[PDB]
DNA sequence: CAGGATGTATATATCTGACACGTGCCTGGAGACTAGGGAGTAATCCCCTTGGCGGTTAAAACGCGGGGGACAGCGCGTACGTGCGTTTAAGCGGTGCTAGAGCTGTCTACGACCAATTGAGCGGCCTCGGCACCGGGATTCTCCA
DNA sequence: TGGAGAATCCCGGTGCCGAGGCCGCTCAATTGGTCGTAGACAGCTCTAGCACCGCTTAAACGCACGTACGCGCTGTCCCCCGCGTTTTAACCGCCAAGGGGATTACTCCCTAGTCTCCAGGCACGTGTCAGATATATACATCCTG
């Protein structure tokens, strides 16, 4: 009975439907968009946690707190450039020093 | 005497965040002008913005559309 | 009566990673960050629809407006992704 | 006695790794409020909307700053002279 | 046959007001068209999501006077809402 | 008897309000909203025109070319600030020499 | 295989340079221009290209060229007609 | 021959002058090539291929700003190739 | 390299307030049923994109030669970095209130829906003056002697 | 220093086409009418945001000084500017062909809206354990050697 049991997702159809209705994105719009945006959301929030729950297997924590968020988007190259206009609250920076500043003959 | 707040150690906190090794003393006065500006053009907006609202409480949520508006929407409180 | 999406995304990390928590600070990242590409793909394909003059929003058009706003690999499975997840929706 | 410059790379690794808020508080409580009340008379401020100023200020400064960083790089220096803030501001866009 | 909107007589007879011995080309009444229309859209943008997040299905003056002066930068945006006014006040004196 | 007329002003306001309904913007529209948008655009119009007509004495052409219009916004900082993110096409860029650049 | 990246020419970069006000100019800077063309005519044709895709055309027009544009920040006056 | 003074003439009567600098088929063939890696047999209006070329310039005489101002920073006037990975890495791509 | 002197990474003891789960009411999700209009489909026609060809001539391409900027190195003067003591007030914990945001509920004016009436607005076509073009002469100015 | 030639500005006419403005036509603006519901208004509730007050405690603030780092001088070298020659292909304008955009026309489904009911998501509440902290240990740096 549930729209999402039929569409075999867990962002639910009926709340995302109602939203971009609410939303006046449109006056008319269709039944089969809402399955399909609540996917395309399921899909980044795979992205982001599969590489999220990578950087927090390897600072050896079982509790994901924003600094392994902020790994998880500025390590991989691709969704900073989706997101890189977005900062993010207690996320920190990223382990970065030029070589040229390094001193040698030691 | 209250514009000073921004103090010269927390400014080579800042600094030292940077990654450089030597800091030059006309920076800190520099960064209170650089800086000043940025936080005087977010109220500028998000002010307006709260007096919008018949509202006379500046909140956590109304001032996350000011630096939307800006363009560097951020995360964490909302929004 | 303040509502959320504190409930769906974990039962995504619980698919994936079934022995991980996560703080209510990153919940806030993870939920803010849904609710900016809730509007984004949203606000995308709400003006594309009035730019060929179409008023009904299609399954078809908010597909566009994924292949805009993300870069190239991301872009190319997103789409497949959801094809897959549609074509058994409409069969049943 | 440390050879000077040496504890600054000491002290970036610990900056790296650390996500803690950078600069203090409540002094900068009365700064955005004293901007504030000059601008309109009688504007409160709930406490999470000034820690929402903090990271959003903190969050222009180092990026400004790691960006005069690799600028300061390209003049075969170390030390940054504020020339570099201007141009910085230059390229951006932000100033002119 | 066909019907495109335009604003070219608008700007003409605008330009004809303020200085009425100037002429204008085409491409630089297209680049006038094009801006008026980004404008619009921008002001009209920034209204409709000021008045959804206050939770108001409708967008009155003061609507449009916040974005106005979210949009505008300072002393441009104090002579616009002061004629802007002037003219909302004008209209409501008159029926 | 247009709204226009009552109005005072010169843009229409049956146009403006016509897109404010068909727009999306909301939808629901109050009564001087599209006045008020109408009388915000008198005013961005002819700030350039009076802009485009210095520089049109000061090459002394009776014509608007579209190099006019690009000095009409570029020479002043209060229009460059709000027209930073858009180019104006066959306009070029206003003439500027560095000093440094410059011999002797 | 041809000549296409390279059909710009070695004056061309030259006369945009003197409209950007350098002085002097390298050898060297040239074959890089051209990667920055195209990267940057690689992200804006890509955005015009699902435009027209979705418009049910085979035929690239002179308006969803602007808000590919649009898009990018980098916005367009006289043809969004 | 004349040592700097054709120098400072051509940078004059450029920052003056309205008159287009990319080459018009070399762009228009151009412009075929790339497309063509996307989407085959693609037609082009007259309007939007010329919308494409003051894009490009109009990007790069403003790009071409941004290096001079690197080139004063390092106390020369010759652009080097780094001044572009310079002001593209400032700016934000 | 090289021993010593410390700043950073490790390790378990612990502890506490956030985190994950449980209740249930309740308000939005869902099922059902009708209406009518947005769009699917299709047929036509006409802009309008593409292709091509050849004369013209502005401009690209290459080579050569010199003179001026890039840069490596140097030298010097000085501007912060590390350290240590000194002074400040950052920040924590607690009480308190009081100004104002949220909730609640009734109302009414204003804007949405509709028919008709028509004049603002527009496509098209005619007309001529501004403006770019061809050509000739005055006016600088920077390199040569 | 003068001089001579290379480029810039301007002046006179002109022929061209792009603005300008009128002319007949039409479709969206407007006027008049209604109805309900979104916003406005006002009164009550209770939460949060100022707000003084001491305490101790990291952190800011001032001083000192050495050193390596920032800035000016300078010589070299080659690379880039700058011309002349040759070469390249771009530009206009002429004509052919059809391809697919844009318009008009027809029907039908499928989503908007009402009605009605049901459960899953959210406020409150809980108890527990993960990482913050803490103080002793290794270890992996760098400094004068």
Same mark, same amino acid.
């Given at each position: ?6 569409? $075999?997702?867990?962002? #639910? ?9 609410? $939303? ?9 968009? #809402? ?6 959301? &399921?899909?980044?929030?795979? &992205?982001?946690? &599969? ?6 297997? =390897? ?10 968020? /902020?790994?998880?988007?500025?390590? =991989? &190259? ?11 609250? /207690? ?6 020093? /030029?070589?040229?500043?390094? #001193?040698?003959?030691? | ?15 030292? !965040? ?27 907006? %998000?002010? @307006?913005? @709260?007096?919008? %609202? ?11 559309? %000011?630096?939307?508006?800006?363009? !560097? @929407? ?6 | ?13 619980? *698919? ?46 908010? *597909? ?29 | ?19 803690? +808020? ?30 929402? +100023? ?6 222009? +400064?180092?990026? +400004? ?32």
């Amino acid at each position: 009975k549930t729209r999402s049991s039929r569409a $075999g997702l867990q962002f #639910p159809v009926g709340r995302v439907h109602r939203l971009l209705r609410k $939303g006046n994105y449109a006056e008319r719009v269709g039944a089969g968009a #809402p399955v399909y945006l609540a996917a395309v959301l &399921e899909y980044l929030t795979a &992205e982001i946690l &599969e590489l999220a729950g990578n950087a927090a297997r =390897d600072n050896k924590k079982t509790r994901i707190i924003p600094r392994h968020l /902020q790994l998880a988007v500025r390590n =991989d &190259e691709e969704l900073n450039k989706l997101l890189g206009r977005v900062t993010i609250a /207690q996320g920190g920076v990223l382990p970065n020093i /030029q070589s040229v500043l390094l #001193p040698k003959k030691t | 005497d209250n514009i000073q707040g921004i103090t010269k150690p927390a400014i080579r906190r800042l600094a030292r !965040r940077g990654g450089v090794k030597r800091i030059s003393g006309l920076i800190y006065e520099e960064t209170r002008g650089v800086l000043k500006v940025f936080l005087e053009n977010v109220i500028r907006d %998000a002010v @307006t913005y @709260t007096e919008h %609202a018949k509202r006379k409480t500046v909140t956590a949520m109304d001032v996350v559309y %000011a630096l939307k508006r800006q363009g !560097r @929407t951020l995360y964490g409180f909302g929004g | 009566r303040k509502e959320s999406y504190a409930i769906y995304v974990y039962k995504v990390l619980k *698919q994936v990673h079934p022995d991980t928590g996560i703080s209510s600070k990153a919940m806030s990242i993870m939920n803010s960050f849904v609710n900016d590409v809730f509007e984004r793909i949203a606000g995308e394909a709400s003006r594309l629809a009035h730019y060929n003059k179409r008023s009904t929003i299609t399954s078809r058009e908010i *597909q566009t407006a994924v292949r805009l706003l993300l870069p190239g690999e991301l872009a190319k499975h997103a789409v497949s992704e959801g094809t897959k997840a549609v074509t058994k929706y409409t069969s049943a | 006695r440390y050879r000077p410059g040496t504890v600054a790379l000491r002290e970036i690794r610990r900056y790296q790794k650390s996500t803690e +808020l950078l600069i203090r508080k409540l002094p900068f409580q009365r700064l955005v409020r004293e901007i504030a009340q000059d601008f309109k008379t009688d504007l409160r401020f709930q406490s999470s909307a000034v820690m929402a +100023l903090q990271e959003a200020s903190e969050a222009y +400064l180092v990026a +400004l700053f790691e960006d005069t960083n690799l600028a300061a790089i390209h003049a075969k220096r170390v030390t940054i002279m504020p020339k570099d803030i201007q141009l910085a501001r230059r390229i951006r866009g932000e100033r002119a």
